[PDB]
Structure formats: structure tokens, C-alpha cells
Design a protein around this ligand. Structure first.
Ligand SMILES: NC(=O)N[C@@H](CC(=O)O)C(=O)O
Ligand SMILES: NC(=O)N[C@@H](CC(=O)O)C(=O)O
Ligand SMILES: [Zn+2]
Ligand SMILES: [Zn+2]
Ligand SMILES: [Zn+2]
Ligand SMILES: [Zn+2]
Ligand SMILES: [Zn+2]
Ligand SMILES: [Zn+2]
Ligand SMILES: [Zn+2]
Ligand SMILES: [Zn+2]
Ligand SMILES: [Zn+2]
Ligand SMILES: [Zn+2]
Lengths: 354, 354
């Protein structure tokens, strides 16, 4: 017997188009999404060119409309030059992304004053999300309070971070957060297997105590989001490995495994991959859209999943229980048992919908 | 310039049919909902007969399908006899309502052991909501923990209650809650004007400190819900006044007034009248459904609103800013400037939808 889920939403993916299409493109990355039970993705702006102004957003919008197989929204990225320039296009984006630490991006902001300027100029009713690690979480929360608005923290990975967010929520501060599967299911213990190149990710893998703190504080986690960050094996295994893991095809199977073990409920999963993404990012429903999963199917993650061009995975060898059987998107069969059945371009920009 | 909102959801209404139809019926109560910008309502089970078994639910379902003008879900009610008997129909209901204090209902449970029995037998993935005042909030939270499941607290009205819920959320306990407009906008200060009959409501009106504590702790409030509880003026003004206020037609205008004063944002309103109702009660989207409001229109609440058969209101004389201009429900104009334009029976049981 299958179980039917609503269309799941991943609010943090890297689809690499424009400019990195050997790693992934809209067509391959959204095929990976559908195979992972994801029918809507929010794509990060750290592409080449980066999505930091109106002409780059327009280009990316057309590339996504032509290549995407599931529906999508595109983030804008904050830069050191573009505060106060995004107002006419802000509503067409998923939100504004701030890169506040070193990672795979050229968009790091060098002064908290630049963060303040973005918080003051971006429309106050639209989302701001931040790459903000360790003390940077506290710093960006301070900027949010000074400008009296909300903030969403991307890929929370550490005990320190989740406890800070917990303390802020207890004081009634408007903060939400997401956690990525690798920070729930991998730790320092896995770095020997992965090696130093494959193991490169930001935030870095945490200790067992970090992983246990995230699970213990599940009530504080508003969303799961993959931070699907594909790079080729050649890049991961080379002399200057970029940080990031592919994850669209493995996120839901890993989480279903945890559900099967009683670590969280199916409702907990649906709040974090459907309802809270909708409400934090104001994302629309998808009509006649659902995901059919088999909760009982046991399998072992192989050395690469079928669709991502990354052609590797850090979860190789993990035993999982649960699999995606069929996805229907807006009344068309989009995926069945390893075959994607909607073409590049089927997907639509959800921010253009009524 | 108007503003377009999604279809708002009221998870706590009394539509009085069957058995109290001089107070309200499905047709009049859903007309009141639409005029208040509400396109989906969850109707409480304290009718005559009360909705405490399968035959009563079947009757109510057909009466609602024939009379409702907006969409709906029907609660089941817990009784001293029906624990362990509702499993086949539980999924067809909005949830299970527990009456744990004295109020307008014959369904009070007389032993916490009966509460435990319901928490143990009702399907653990479906909603339980409770009328639970003062220490009863703590008691029902204890029962929820002992049975390791969630609970939703209806019409939170007191500083004591919101602070208890806040403490439980800080410990990661799965509790949500709602607040009704009269406990945000009326207090002991209004009892002289209302008088002792009209002023009868459960929970009773609080002190100014109770009202201020609810506002100060808005981050703890998951939903707004009217507890629309219509009774005629003759009943309210007579020798044994029943408790309750009508409220569908005044809820959104009162809350829009607060938005206009900066007391909360429009997003705060949409989380509490749309997104969190959806996610707590697993309620489906409504296609081609929206509510158009004028945020600038100033008016004074009259001695009765047009649609509720209660034909009175405790908010008479309050100045408000904001009004519902037009409602579209599933592609049909349902309401425009004081005229309902969909007939009794247009509304549907959302739990029968895919
Ligand atoms: N997380 C990573 O390690 N890499 C991400 C960037 C990011 O999310 O910081 C990427 O785009 O490769
Ligand atoms: N709240 C009230 O004062 N009355 C409600 C019952 C309830 O919500 O307890 C009613 O049904 O009249
Ligand atoms: Zn397209
Ligand atoms: Zn990041
Ligand atoms: Zn993110
Ligand atoms: Zn990222
Ligand atoms: Zn929204
Ligand atoms: Zn009908
Ligand atoms: Zn009640
Ligand atoms: Zn309620
Ligand atoms: Zn009630
Ligand atoms: Zn749901």
C-alpha cells in the first residue's frame, strides 16, 4: 500500500544554470527534484552571472522556464552594490539571500552595515534568508531586530546555532530556520569514509553532539531543505574542492527512514517539507499535484543517484527505508519508478501565478 | 486600491444546525462567514443532536452540504460514551473536540481518565482540540504528554493560559492554540456597557492585563478563530443567558483595524487566518478563491451585522478601519458589498476532497 503526500517544496537548491551547467542544469536538477518527491524548488542566486540584478534575474527566469521540469521560484542575491536597487523586481523572486560567511559564492558581504542596508531597503514583507554560521546567526538576528523584521536561517548545522535560535524564539523574535539532511544523518564520524574532498561542505559536518542537538530540538526546525549543491566528482576530488553535497534525490528517502524508526512522524515531515515552506515564503498551492511513496521499500544508496549531474553522493552505502514511486504535477505524470516523464520546460515560475 | 487576500479559514464556529436554527443555520452562518472574508469554516459539534456518533455526523454532513454557502469541515465531539467508537468516521471530521469546562454544551467530561481514553483511542495523526480554561490547559497538556501526542487549545483568553502555553512550547511540547477577537478587543472594562447577559461568554472576558498579555505574546498564538457563538438577543437578555458572542462578521474588520494601527502585520494576520489553520487541521487549498479588502474604509460597528441570526453584537459602537469588499469562492462571486451571491448548498465538505 502506497501513501499519497502533497507536493513537497525544497526552499534551498543550487541548479547551477547559468554558468555551471556541467555540475547541474535546470533540466537535470528538476529531474532530481521530481525523483526525490519534490514538486517545487527555490533556486539560489550564486550562479555565473549571479542573480543580483534585474537583467540577471530575467535571464535566469527564461532559462528556468525553458529547462525546469518542476515548478520553481528564483532567489535574488544580496551584493555589496545592490541594496536599494531591487525594489521593482523583489516581488518576482523567492526572497533575498545573504551570504554572510565563506562558502561557494562571490557574494560575501564584508560589513554588517551592508547587512543593515539590505534589511532597510528590501521590502519588509518579503523573505530574507541568510547563510549565517555560528556567531553570525546571533549577528544577523541583531540586524533583524534593529530593523524590526524577520529573518530565515539557512542550513542550521550546530548545537550552538539551534540553541541560539531556540532562545530567540522563546523571546518571541521572528526567526525561522531550516536544516539539511546531511546535518541530520552525517557527522565527523563519516569524514574518514568520505575523505577530505568529498567531505567539504558549508556548514561543515558537525560532531555527534551537533547532530543529536538538532534531533533533540526538532520543534525548533521550521523546514527541511536539501541545500542541493552539486559539483562533479572531479571537482570534489581535486586540489581545490568546492564545498557542497547533492541531495535532492536522497533527502526524502533519508527522512522517510527516520519516520520508519519513530524519530519523527509523517506529519512532522509534512510540516517541514510542505506547510512551513508555503507559509514562510508565501508559495502557492499546486493544483492536482501529489507524491506517492512506498514506506516499506528497503534499499541501499548507490555511488550516484540517477539524475543529478554531480554523479556522486555522500550518502553512498546508507541503508534507507522508503522510496518515491510516482509524482503527479498539475495533472500530468511527472515521475514513475526511475523515469521522469515531463520534459524540460514543463515547470513554471510560481511567483507569476495569481 | 484594494488588497487581495487568500481564502481565510475560521477553525472555530457554531452554526447551530441541527437543533438551534433560530440562533443560526448553515445558510445564515456561512453568509456571515463570507461577509467576514471567511471561505472555510470548521463547525463545532455542540448541536442538538450533538455530533458524537456516526449517524449524527451523517445528518450534519447532509444538512451542511445543502445549506452551507462556503466550504466547511465538521468536528466530532467527545462524550463520556464514545471513546473507541469513532475510528471509522474520524477522518471525515475536522477533528475531535473536548469540552473540559462548563460552557454551552452537554458534553462535559467528568474525569481526566475519560480525556486519557479519548487521547488513546482517537487516531493519533488527527486533530484534537480542547475547551480548556486556566488550570485545565495544564491538565490537558499533561494528558497529551502522557499519551505522546499533540493538542490544540481553543479560545485562549488569559495571561495565565498564554504563559503556560508559552512555557510548554519552550520545552518543545506539541501544542498549538487560537485566540478569539473578543479576548483581544474587549475586557472587564466593557462589561458595564454590555451588561450581565450580553457579556456572558466562555472563557469570560479578561482583565486589561489579560488582553495586554495576549497581545504581548502574539508570537505564541498560532491561529485566530472567532468562536462564533450566536444566540438571539431574547436569549442573551433573559433570565438564564447562554454564553457566547457572534463574531464571523466582525473578526476580520477588527483585526484589520489592529493592522492599520501597527499592532500586527498583514502577514501576521495571514499566518493566523490561513496558513496555520491549514497546517494544524490539514485543510486543503481552495482553488480560484480570494478575498478583496479595502484597508482604508472607516466605519462604526452597528447594533447588529446583516447576516447572523443572532441579530446583535458585543462590538456595537467600536470604530474599525478595513472592510471586506468582494469574495470569490472556487471561481464564483460569493459576496460583494453586503450581498451574498452564492446560494445555500454552494459550499462543500472539504474532507471529501482529494
Ligand atoms: N553549502 C555548500 O557547501 N555549498 C553551496 C553554497 C551554500 O549553501 O553555502 C554551493 O552552492 O555549492
Ligand atoms: N464560548 C461560548 O461562550 N459559547 C459557545 C461554546 C464554547 O466555545 O465553549 C457556544 O456554543 O455558545
Ligand atoms: Zn515552463
Ligand atoms: Zn549556504
Ligand atoms: Zn536556505
Ligand atoms: Zn546553498
Ligand atoms: Zn501566504
Ligand atoms: Zn453543497
Ligand atoms: Zn469553548
Ligand atoms: Zn477552537
Ligand atoms: Zn466554541
Ligand atoms: Zn497537510
Amino acid at each position: 500500500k502506497l501513501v499519497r503526500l502533497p507536493g513537497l517544496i525544497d526552499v534551498h537548491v543550487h541548479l547551477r544554470e547559468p554558468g555551471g551547467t556541467h555540475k547541474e542544469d535546470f533540466a537535470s536538477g528538476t529531474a532530481a527534484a521530481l525523483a526525490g518527491g519534490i514538486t517545487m524548488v527555490c533556486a539560489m542566486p550564486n550562479t555565473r552571472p549571479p542573480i543580483i540584478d534585474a537583467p540577471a534575474l530575467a535571464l535566469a527566469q527564461k532559462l528556468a522556464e525553458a529547462g525546469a521540469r518542476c515548478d520553481f521560484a528564483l532567489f535574488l542575491g544580496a551584493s555589496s552594490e545592490n541594496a536599494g536597487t531591487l525594489g521593482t523586481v523583489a516581488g518576482s523572486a523567492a526572497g533575498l539571500k545573504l551570504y554572510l560567511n565563506e562558502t561557494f559564492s562571490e557574494l560575501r558581504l564584508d560589513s554588517v552595515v551592508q547587512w543593515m542596508e539590505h534589511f532597510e531597503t528590501w521590502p519588509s514583507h518579503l523573505p530574507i534568508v541568510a547563510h549565517a554560521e555560528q556567531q553570525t546567526v546571533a549577528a544577523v538576528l541583531m540586524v533583524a531586530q534593529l530593523t524590526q523584521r524577520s529573518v530565515h536561517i539557512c542550513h542550521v548545522a550546530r548545537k550552538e546555532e539551534i540553541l541560539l535560535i531556540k532562545a530567540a524564539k522563546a523571546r518571541g523574535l521572528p526567526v525561522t530556520c531550516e536544516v539539511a539532511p546531511h546535518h541530520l544523518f552525517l557527522s565527523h564520524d563519516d569524514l574518514e569514509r568520505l575523505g577530505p574532498g568529498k567531505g567539504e561542505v558549508r556548514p561543515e559536518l558537525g560532531s555527534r553532539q551537533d547532530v543529536e542537538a538538532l534531533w533533540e530540538n526538532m520543534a525548533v526546525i521550521d523546514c527541511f531543505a536539501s541545500d542541493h549543491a552539486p559539483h562533479t566528482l572531479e571537482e570534489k576530488c581535486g586540489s581545490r574542492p568546492p564545498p557542497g553535497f547533492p541531495g535532492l534525490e536522497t533527502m526524502l528517502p533519508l527522512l522517510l527512514t527516520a519516520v520508519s524508526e519513530g524519530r519523527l512522524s509523517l506529519d512532522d515531515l509534512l510540516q517541514r517539507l510542505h506547510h512551513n515552506p508555503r507559509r514562510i515564503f508565501h508559495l502557492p498551492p499546486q493544483e492536482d499535484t501529489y507524491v506517492e511513496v512506498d514506506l516499506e521499500h528497503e534499499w541501499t544508496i548507490p555511488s550516484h543517484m540517477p539524475f543529478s549531474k554531480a554523479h556522486w553522493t555522500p550518502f553512498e552505502g546508507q541503508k534507507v527505508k522508503g522510496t518515491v514511486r510516482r509524482v503527479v504535477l498539475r495533472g500530468e505524470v511527472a515521475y514513475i519508478d526511475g523515469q521522469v516523464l515531463v520534459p524540460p520546460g514543463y515547470g513554471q515560475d510560481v511567483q507569476k501565478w495569481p
